[PDB]
A paper describes a structure:
We previously isolated human anti-VP6 antibodies and expressed these as Fabs in a bacterial expression system. In the current study, we sought to test the activity of these antibodies as dimeric IgA molecules in a model of immunity at mucosal epithelia. Therefore, the data suggest a mechanism of inhibition of the transcriptional pore is steric hindrance of the pore, rather than induced conformational change.
When identified on a space-filling model of the atomic resolution structure of the VP6 trimer, it became apparent that two separate regions (which we designated region A [amino acids 231–260] or B [amino acids 265–292]) on each VP6 protomer were recognized by the Fab. When we examined the arrangement of the epitope regions A and B from each protomer in the configuration of VP6 trimers on the DLPs, it was clear that the Fab could only bind to regions A and B when they formed a continuous epitope at the junction of two protomers; an Fab could not bind to region A and B on a single protomer. The interaction confirmed the quaternary nature of the epitope, with the antibody interacting with both region A and region B of adjacent VP6 protomers within a single VP6 trimer. The residues on the antibody surface that interacted with VP6 (paratope) also were determined by DXMS. Residues 52–59, corresponding to the hypervariable complementarity-determining region 2 of the heavy chain (HCDR2) was shown to be strongly protected from exchange upon complex formation. The light chain residues 25–42 and 85–94 also were shown to be protected strongly upon complex formation. Poisson-Boltzmann analysis of the Fab electrostatic surface show that both paratope regions in the heavy and light chains resided in positively-charged regions of the Fab surface (paratope shown in Figure S2 in File S1). The light chain inserted deeper into the transcription pore, while the heavy chain bound to a region higher up in the pore. There are five epitopes at the Type I channel, but modeling indicates that steric hindrance between Fab fragments limits the number of Fab fragments bound per channel to a maximum of one. The size of the Fab in the Type I channel likely is sufficient to sterically block RNA egress from the channel even if the charge determinants are not essential to replication.
Residue numbers in the entry:
A (entry chain L): 1 to 212
B (entry chain H): 1 to 134, 141 to 220
The structure:
Amino acid sequence: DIRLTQSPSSLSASVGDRVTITCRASQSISNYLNWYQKKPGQAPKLLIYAATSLQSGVPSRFSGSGSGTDFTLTISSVQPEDFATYYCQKTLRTWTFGQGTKVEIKRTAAAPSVFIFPPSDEQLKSGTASVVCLLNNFYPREAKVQWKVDNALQSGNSQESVTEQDSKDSTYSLSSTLTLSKADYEKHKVYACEVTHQGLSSPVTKSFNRGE
Amino acid sequence: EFQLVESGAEVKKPGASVKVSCKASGYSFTSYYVHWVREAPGEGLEWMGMINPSDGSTYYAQRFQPRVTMTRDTSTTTVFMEMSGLRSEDTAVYYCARGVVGATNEIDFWGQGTTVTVSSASFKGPSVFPLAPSGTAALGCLVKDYFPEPVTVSWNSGALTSGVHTFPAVLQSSGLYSLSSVVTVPSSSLGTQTYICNVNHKPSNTKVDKKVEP
């Protein structure tokens, strides 16, 4: 029926900041809007119900406003336990959730430490080769990794994962894996990982040569 | 004291059906609605529907309407969510939650959630490969070709917790998962210290210890 749009998708903030999150409804949904906090590995926690009402046991720094089509969830001063994803929910007819706004911790830029791992000899026994590229402790999250085999750009044949913000330094880490058959792997000499990141003046390349 | 205990993690073949149970306790069963909400990996919260355990009245999201049936058993104060024609996109954690409706409208209490994984892959313990070290040195463990989730990796039992990153797993084209766990250590240690990853795949009763050498 009625769509819900949340803004922004991603937000960065420091402890004690004031953060504002927005939910826009495609039609008037009046009062019927709730706000949730959701951290990874747990069920959602209800913060605000009926657009403006504070749920019992929720700290006062949380508050909601709006009616009709436009809703705001603000946190007056962000406390370190407040870094989570936030959802709005229509509580009318279909109880549709919004997309979620992820509230992450702001910090100074940090360049990734870059590492390349050739396949191990025991993995090659299996007839598979996996080259792993590690991007360690970087901020902000946005980064770009490129695999180049014999200086030829690779696309669509690697997998990657990113950690959540570290609990102590608030940086991210990323691992990328290029996987080939032992046959293919033995057909090439040079395996390279190119990384561009705003903490880097120019792109960084780590690489190795199979026979060496 | 309030409790919504959900059925344990389940793996189902594509095209099959799943029936997740929600046993409620610690409050009067007929006085609250039960909601079902799911979260597929990398997606946001998705509301599926409601049920009134007083009458058995249901209200579904249109998106799940023909595949999802919710029922209750009042004698056992238990709610059920049945989903048919499961596809890999139905792989998610499924929550049930207790909710008041009408004069006030909110979901106030939540279950622990149930992982349903939808795949044709057979259970399989991981192959563990070393990520050999090449002022600080990184080394690690490539944990390849296991099913299902999850795997735990620790270092040195675990004397080493610092600077460790265990990456979220990826689903490979094979239908098996794969991840890396990396740690940074002093380059000076590579002559003295032996580094072991302790990989534990509980779902297959598999434990692997791989020494990572320079």
